[PDB]
């Protein structure tokens, strides 16, 4: 479990962030609570500001939605930095533009995250 941690992309250095409309992206660190995330212990990754759950689909889109208990909202954190969706098996990824998505694991640094 974790409370109010940042989730930083190892490659870009940008932080996972989201808004009340459910958009997810990365931005440079700004100290705000939209850039913090909380993991209760049920596999969810909840935005500390909005309370919405990180979610994704088989096409690789990522977004936040009200927490609904489903497997698309459950994530596995690996000690090597992967963040894997339980339903799809795809891992969280992002780019220098700030887009966030999921892709099959390919060992790249864009799929490594530092959570703390
Ligand atoms: Na973050
Ligand atoms: Na979640
Ligand atoms: Na990942």
From Swiss-Prot:
It comes from the Bacteria. Sequence repeats lie at residues 3-40, 41-78, 79-116. Changing residue 73 to A: Partial loss of HIV fusion inhibition. GO terms for biological process: regulation of defense response to virus. GO terms for molecular function: carbohydrate binding. Keywords: Antiviral protein, Lectin, Repeat, Signal. Interacts with HIV gp120 and SIV gp130. Anti-HIV protein that inhibits virus membrane fusion. This is Actinohivin.
């Amino acid at each position: 479990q974790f409370a109010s941690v940042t989730i930083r992309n190892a490659q870009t250095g940008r932080l996972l962030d989201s808004n009340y409309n459910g958009n997810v992206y990365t931005l440079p660190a700004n100290g705000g609570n939209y850039q913090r995330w909380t993991g209760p212990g049920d596999g969810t990754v909840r935005n500390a500001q909005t309370g919405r759950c990180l979610d994704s689909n088989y096409d690789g889109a990522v977004y936040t939605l009200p927490c609904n208990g489903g497997s698309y909202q459950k994530w596995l954190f690996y000690s090597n930095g992967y963040i894997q969706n339980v339903e799809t098996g795809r891992v969280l990824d992002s780019n220098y533009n700030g887009n966030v998505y999921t892709l099959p694991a390919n060992g790249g640094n864009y799929q490594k995250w530092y959570t703390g």
